[PDB]
């Protein structure tokens, strides 16, 4: 079988700059194919036969390489070019390289929300931590319950990159039984991010306004 290894996993650039994406094949001498998949859109053939442009593909896309080492270059990239790019040989695919928009570092504003009294009546407590309008997307959210670090009982969700300001937002939801929720007092979300000189904690005390 053939293995195709793409790099980098994520490339962060601005419109007008030039993007270089790499796809390495485990076997030499086969032609390379590239696809573009914009978020939520049908995949699109970009390059075939290593350097040939598919229908409607502008000349700023350049496919190149040979042997085992293949490249997709996007010259003076357009805002429409932020997407995931995949290489292919026969039935075999790379795992994709994502082109995302670079911007200045932005620390997240952080908010914590207690479970509502309505939900608690049902036997479950959801505690939510919001990280708003930050860049880059990498962030660490740690839940603490009376300073005990939580593991295995939270789920995160991250928005698509904002089309105007290029930031991300993120939620983390901690799920507890009502019984467990009522056993402890201090509920805290600790956030680590490149824009923060030290981690930021937001917290509330159960039963306290």
């Amino acid at each position: 079988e053939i293995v195709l290894t793409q790099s980098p996993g994520i490339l962060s650039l601005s419109p007008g700059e030039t993007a270089t994406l790499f796809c390495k094949a485990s076997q030499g001498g086969n032609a390379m194919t590239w696809y573009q998949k914009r978020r939520g859109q049908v995949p699109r053939l970009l390059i075939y036969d290593t350097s040939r442009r598919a229908s409607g593909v502008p000349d700023r896309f350049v496919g190149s390489g040979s042997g085992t080492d293949f490249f997709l270059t996007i010259n003076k990239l357009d805002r429409e070019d932020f997407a995931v790019y995949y290489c292919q040989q026969f039935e075999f695919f790379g795992l994709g390289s994502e082109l995302e928009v670079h911007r200045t570092v932005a620390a997240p504003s952080v908010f914590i929300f207690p479970p509502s009294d309505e939900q608690l009546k049902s036997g479950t407590a959801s505690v939510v931590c919001l990280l708003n309008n930050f860049y880059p997307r990498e962030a660490k959210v740690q839940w603490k319950v009376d300073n005990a670090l939580q593991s295995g009982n939270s789920q995160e969700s991250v928005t698509e990159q904002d089309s105007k300001d290029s930031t991300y937002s993120l939620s983390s939801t901690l799920t507890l039984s009502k019984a467990d929720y009522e056993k402890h007092k201090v509920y805290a979300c600790e956030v680590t991010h490149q824009g923060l000189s030290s981690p930021v904690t937001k917290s509330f005390n159960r039963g306290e306004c």
Binding site: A31, L45, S109, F113, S116, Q119, L130, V158, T173, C209
Partner: protein, 231 residues
């Protein structure tokens, strides 16, 4: 104009099979191989197989052998060869098969083979789950107990299947809103939250209502979000 049009999204129970259609037009259907490929969350593309419509010859991915059955319907009038329908039936489904499935076809290159896919169907989402349809419970994410920026929201919990739509104040509030992609919980039910940031000074003057719609259960909820009642 080559066109490939697939059947719609579907929910399937574990152990069942799904038959997806690919209605082709704009070229002689008997003369090109139709391929199938799926895009799997966290794993990428996986080629499924191909079918050559003339005689129905097929080739399936070795690791999927037994799970795949491709068939086709040909035009029976030789006056009218430029359409056909290809089918891909995928059996023994498990939640790992939740993915977006595509019929694809090569372009104009006569020497490049059948794998460089110029033409794509629009995709068919298949969700494999044992869960039953269920409308969401909507709970407030209440603004923290200033004059500055406050955050508030709605937690939309325990619904199946996707999707839910959320608006604020019947679409009058859009700036600062973030409606997060849903997460699948260990229960097999989805959950998401929708939040908005606003000036703190507006919390006593402005009403904030999230409008939650879950068409699969025809659930519609309007939840007013306000500061929690304190002593």
């Amino acid at each position: 104009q080559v066109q490939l049009v697939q059947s719609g999204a579907v929910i399937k129970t574990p152990g069942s099979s799904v038959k997806i259609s690919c209605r082709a037009s704009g070229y002689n259907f008997r003369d090109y191989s139709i391929h199938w490929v799926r895009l799997i969350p966290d794993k990428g593309f996986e080629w499924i197989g191909w079918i050559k419509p003339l005689w129905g010859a097929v080739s399936y991915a070795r690791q999927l052998q037994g799970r795949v059955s491709m068939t086709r319907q040909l035009s029976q009038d030789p006056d009218d060869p430029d359409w056909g329908v290809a089918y891909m039936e995928f059996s023994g489904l498990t939640p790992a098969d939740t993915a977006e499935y595509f019929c694809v076809r090569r372009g104009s290159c006569d020497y490049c083979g059948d794998f460089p896919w110029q033409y794509w169907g629009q995709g068919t989402v298949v969700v494999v789950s044992s869960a039953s349809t269920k409308g969401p419970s909507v709970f407030p994410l209440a603004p923290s107990s200033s004059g500055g920026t406050a955050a508030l929201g709605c937690l939309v919990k325990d619904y199946f299947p996707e999707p839910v739509t959320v608006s604020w104040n019947s679409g009058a509030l859009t700036s600062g809103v973030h409606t997060f992609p849903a997460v699948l919980q260990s229960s097999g039910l989805y959950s998401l939250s929708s939040v908005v940031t606003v000036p703190s000074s507006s919390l006593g003057t402005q009403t904030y209502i999230c409008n939650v719609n879950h068409k699969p259960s025809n659930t519609k909820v309007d939840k007013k979000v306000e500061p929690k009642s304190c002593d």
